[PDB]
Design a protein around this nucleic acid. Sequence first.
RNA 1: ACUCCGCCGGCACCUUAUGAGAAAUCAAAGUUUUUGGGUUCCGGGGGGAGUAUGGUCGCAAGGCUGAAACUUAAAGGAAGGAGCG
Lengths: 98, 202, 150, 220, 44, 82, 129, 68
Amino acid sequence: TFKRRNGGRNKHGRGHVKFIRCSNCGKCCPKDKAIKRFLVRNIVEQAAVRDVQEACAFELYTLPKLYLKMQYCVSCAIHSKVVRVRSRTDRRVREPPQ
Amino acid sequence: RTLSTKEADIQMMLAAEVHLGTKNCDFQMERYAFKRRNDGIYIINLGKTWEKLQMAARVIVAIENPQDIIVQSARPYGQRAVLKFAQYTGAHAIAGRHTPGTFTNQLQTSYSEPRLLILTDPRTDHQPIKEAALGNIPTIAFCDTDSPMRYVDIGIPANNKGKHSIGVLFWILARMVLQMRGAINQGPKWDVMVDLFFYREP
Amino acid sequence: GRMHSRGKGISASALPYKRTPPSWLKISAPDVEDNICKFAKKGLTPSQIGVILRDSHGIAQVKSVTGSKILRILKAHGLAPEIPEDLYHLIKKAVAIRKHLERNRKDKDSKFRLILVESRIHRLARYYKKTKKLPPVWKYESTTASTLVA
Amino acid sequence: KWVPVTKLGRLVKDGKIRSLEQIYLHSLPIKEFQIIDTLIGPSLKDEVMKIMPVQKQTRAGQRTRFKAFVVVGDGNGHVGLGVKCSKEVATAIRGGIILAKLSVIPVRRGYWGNKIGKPHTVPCKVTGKCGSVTVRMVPAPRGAGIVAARVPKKVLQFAGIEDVFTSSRGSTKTLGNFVKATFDCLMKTYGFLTPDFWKETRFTKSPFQEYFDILAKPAN
Amino acid sequence: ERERRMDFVPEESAIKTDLIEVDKETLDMLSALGMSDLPGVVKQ
Amino acid sequence: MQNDEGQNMDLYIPRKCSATNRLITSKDHASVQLNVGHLDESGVYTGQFTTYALCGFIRAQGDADSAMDRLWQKKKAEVGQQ
Amino acid sequence: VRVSVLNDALKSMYNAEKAGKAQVELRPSSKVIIKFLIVMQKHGYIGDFQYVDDHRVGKIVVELNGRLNKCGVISPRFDVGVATIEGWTARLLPSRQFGYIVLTTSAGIMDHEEARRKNVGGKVLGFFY
Amino acid sequence: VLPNDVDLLNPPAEHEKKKHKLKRLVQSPNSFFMDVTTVFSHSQTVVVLCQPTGGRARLIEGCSFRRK
RNA sequence: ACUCCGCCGGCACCUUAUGAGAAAUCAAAGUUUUUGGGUUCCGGGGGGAGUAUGGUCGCAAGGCUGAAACUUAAAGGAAGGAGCG
Ligand SMILES: [K+]
Ligand SMILES: [K+]
Ligand SMILES: [K+]
Ligand SMILES: [K+]
Ligand SMILES: [Mg+2]
Ligand SMILES: [Mg+2]
Ligand SMILES: [Mg+2]
Ligand SMILES: [Mg+2]
Ligand SMILES: [Mg+2]
Ligand SMILES: [Mg+2]
Ligand SMILES: [Mg+2]
Ligand SMILES: [Mg+2]
Ligand SMILES: [Mg+2]
Ligand SMILES: [Zn+2]
């Protein structure tokens, strides 16, 4: 039984795609199959912004942000709850959630 | 100068924005669209809209018993026009939600066997249109540029979204049905006011 | 589609329904054939003779003015090359690939294309021998091919 | 007694409609089995084809329901097939008989060669499909008999077919699809446009339009 | 409560037959019908 | 259909779709038969009409609307309607 | 590549007829296609068809009337003597009362009923009913 | 347009205009000649009156060309 | 560079059945008992078995070609309105 029209990856009109290494376990996974999430958050957690802002040595200073691109294998994405098992009808929804 | 019955109706339909279509046109509605403007909106050919209204009226008058005609609307803007349309033409109006099995389940109280079915929008009234195809029930429907034509025998190209467009269309159709019965005098005028068909918000 | 690929292109010329020359074309058939012979003696081929006539003389189709195709006109004057133009260009391409391939032994892509070009040479040469446009014993030889062309 | 709930039920109850062909002509659904008993009732003849138990797995055990295949027909061009599932064998049979009547179709019959006597075979080559089962019927000469397996043969006899050649492909041991495929090609006998149907259509008023006044008046 | 809707009818209809605003494409649509002489129709 | 003598041997003659010319079978519940009324000089229904039958096939394709429009554009020019 | 222009012509008509089209274009045209259409036209299975000259091969537009159930070629074109026509009709035609097999004989392209009258055999082109 | 709302033998002159040159009922070229000394609209040669391109040759703003 | 209309070619996607299918599903896996456009390869219950043997290629690992005796009743695929069920 064929579960997905895309076969679980995103590859059309090409033979080979070089793999990436899972950010969690290091497993090799084709880049077009890996679950990718681009996390942008303040380098200082919200629980410490007040303290760090009070101790600032500059009248004005914008706290930088932390940019991290996370690439998971399927096993880690499911285990870490980055993605969840969806019903047969909901599997086709490709739009990101709210 | 004096305006013919067609020029007066087309003048009335222009004021109600009956000619303003959607930004998308179904391939089976292209024959009624006139031109597309740079805005992307399609303009319905009001000349053909009037002709289909006449054809629909000819089908309605041929029904010996008006109670066999059922006119309904799912969206609130048309729930007022259908009630008034059935008041003057003698049809049977069903405003609100259509109960599945009405045309097929012979044992439920709401069961009916209409000879004709009138609808305001095929896209929103897909249930009665789908169910009418199980009982040899022809259907008339007001169809916008992006309306599916499946199981629609007579499609009237018009704007079935605006509150004024829906009211005017049923007002003109009700007048045509009565004028073809000889109940009222010919011409583009009618003692009834069109505003009785427009949607009355709470 | 293409003989030696998966291409499915359809781009091509579309001849008009009017086979006669336009009313604004005043050049006569003897004048046109004089130019065709004049260009052939300069080394031009039938393909690039018609291009000059179309672009610089307003002659869309030589057959409409003269009633004969360019190659037929050249043959009547003994100016048709011994090797047909299209076969000549395939040999020239095969020579170019082989010359490139002698310095690039690891260019396996070129080695693949050389096989396709030479097989195209042999299919066309076979046809020309059947129609007697080439000598009956004519044979394509990679060793001596470069002497024929260029 | 019978209290019709449909327009056709009232007209048949009144007596305005007196033949199934008048209903078939307008392709009207028949939703009351008493209509069929009023038009071709006395000439019909039911026959249970098979009782098929089906099971649904449950926590406590397996729920067994019985599925009855019933064929009805007068042997003169009308045949019907009904299948009902019920918890009791008797209840399934009674409901299957009702379903068979509600699905009765007209079966067109023709002549193999010369048109001598009454029609005895199918008018053309006709095939029907259900699941993997395909049943083919080829016109046969008079006296050839019904060359078919038991399941198609029973249906063809009730339809009034006397002589036909048949062939099958697929899982005919699936009786449900075998009988349904046979019934499928019998209803296609009126769908094939032969040259004798090329004559232009002369429309007639439908029963609902002809008797609007009788239908307008409520029945009490 | 029928009077809330039925009897409610203003002295002036919401559909003004005069001063009808139309687009360039709409005017050309009426010309094809030969109805470019309507009183209300006027370009924006 | 007709025996060698002449007697009819069909239960009935099914209608043919006015657009596609297909036969309409007894179970084609998506097929509809439509009537278009005739008017007089004044424009009042005169009790006369033209009948059109459509098969479920064409209505399911969504081509009934255009088929009816063409069939009426021709018929009305023949019976004087306009 | 294009092997049988007749197959393309008849396949196009059969698909158009099932979709309920009134017209259909056949390209390329050939004198075999035209003579096959004429046999269908004489028996009232198609309406008026028109040949368009394009200086290359031509095109044909065929008017359909909804009477054509199916039309197809038989490939390869087997030889058919007069005595073997009966077997072919029992195979390709719905019944012994309508439907025609088109043959190419030395006397011209004709249906199998005309071939029996003239007592001439030939090769099968196609069939229709 | 729907298949039955069009006539294959008499298509609108605007529809055939936008069809591919090879897919019209009769093949017709989209090219033409013009005066300036005739020049082909899609000339592959450098005349500098016209500059060849992937399609129509780029003409010069200075001179005026007359189609013929 | 961007905006709008269109043509040809390409990787795909979305809706839909008038189609097909055991179904999953497929705009081709459609135009098939109403069976025929052209052509190549290839399958005939499950195992034994890609094994034995012979040949051939390879430095080798192995590749290509490739059985039988015998054994077995299954192995396997999909899973009023809607679905062949
Ligand atoms: K993925
Ligand atoms: K090219
Ligand atoms: K594209
Ligand atoms: K139930
Ligand atoms: Mg699994
Ligand atoms: Mg590619
Ligand atoms: Mg790979
Ligand atoms: Mg091609
Ligand atoms: Mg090849
Ligand atoms: Mg899909
Ligand atoms: Mg086969
Ligand atoms: Mg085996
Ligand atoms: Mg049920
Ligand atoms: Zn991982």
